Design a protein around this ligand. Structure first.
Ligand SMILES: Nc1nccc(-c2c(-c3ccc(F)cc3)ncn2C2CCCCC2)n1
Length: 292
């Protein structure tokens, strides 16, 4: 159909939290775009709140620019620059195995995306492979983070007073990568986004995490098995057979206090120093860049 006068809606290409995503074209500008559609109906107006978070993040490296936010017909609509494959997509394309060089070159950009989001007072709360997409064209090797649907403010804009420590919370994000404290129902904070990143990295190293594939009955008790397996698996076991850097990262993350400012530079240095020890070149070539 025809959306926002300027765009043409294409076919469905995916979903995000709170809405369906479609391919499209900005006819007036000759640009291909991604369009997220949310009913202006029900109970919850998430597309509009999320849109303000993106704009607050506009300008940062690897944050998708929003071209138009508006409502039309039955939908609130947000138009975004088209982006490439997600890290999960690429992981599959690479036979579900990434070389250490690629893992380290991904960790570098991923830690910075999280630091950027945190610098603007928000926590993502759903760090996972599918929420990271590569750019296109000149930005083909830039890793973008998307979906602020479950994002939340962790400190006051003006005073920077951190939100209060809270318990008995239900899980928000993906169980597979959620932090231990998140499973324990503790309010998520900066440390939590980083811990999750730690699991995503080890996920890329192993092909799967040890708490994956557990069978249960409820669809709520599987999170209990997930949580128990996660707690029962010491870091040294999870990372056995990989550079010590990964366990040091996870250990660092679990040691942070609820309102602590993470040392993002130190985390990136662990990986850069490892990048050097392994002898890898600084050509920034990712595994998939070699697909012949
Ligand atoms: N190709 C492409 N380019 C830009 C954004 C998105 C996108 C959005 C998204 C977020 C905000 C917005 F305004 C428009 C789209 N939510 C999920 N995805 C993808 C996740 C992986 C699978 C395919 C959809 N997709």
């Amino acid at each position: 159909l025809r959306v926002g006068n300027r765009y043409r809606l294409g076919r469905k290409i995916g979903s995000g939290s709170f809405g369906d995503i479609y391919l499209g074209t900005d006819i007036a500008a000759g640009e291909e775009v991604a369009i997220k559609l949310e009913c202006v109906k029900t109970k919850h107006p998430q597309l509009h709140i999320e849109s303000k978070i993106y704009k607050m993040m506009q300008g940062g490296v690897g944050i998708p620019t929003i071209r138009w936010c508006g409502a039309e017909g039955d939908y609130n609509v947000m138009v975004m620059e088209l982006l490439g494959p997600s890290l999960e997509d690429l992981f599959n394309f690479c036979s579900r195995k990434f070389s250490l060089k690629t893992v380290l070159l991904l960790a570098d950009q991923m830690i910075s995306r999280i630091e950027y989001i945190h610098s603007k007072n928000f926590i993502h709360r759903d760090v996972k492979p599918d929420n990271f997409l590569m750019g296109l064209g000149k930005k083909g090797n830039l890793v973008y983070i998307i979906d602020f649907g479950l994002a939340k403010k962790y400190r006051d804009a003006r005073t920077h007073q951190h939100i209060p420590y809270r318990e008995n919370k239900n899980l928000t994000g993906t169980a597979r990568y959620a932090s231990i404290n998140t499973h324990l129902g503790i309010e998520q904070s900066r440390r939590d986004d980083l811990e999750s990143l730690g699991y995503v990295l080890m996920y890329f190293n192993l092909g799967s995490l040890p708490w994956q594939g557990l069978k249960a009955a409820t669809k709520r008790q599987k999170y209990e098995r997930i949580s128990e397996k996660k707690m029962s698996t010491p870091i040294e076991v999870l990372c056995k057979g990989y550079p010590s850097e990964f366990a040091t990262y996870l250990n660092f993350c679990r040691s942070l206090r609820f309102d602590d400012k993470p040392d993002y530079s130190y985390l990136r240095q662990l990986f850069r120093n490892l990048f050097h020890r392994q002898g890898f070149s600084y050509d920034y070539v990712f595994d998939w860049n070699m697909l012949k």
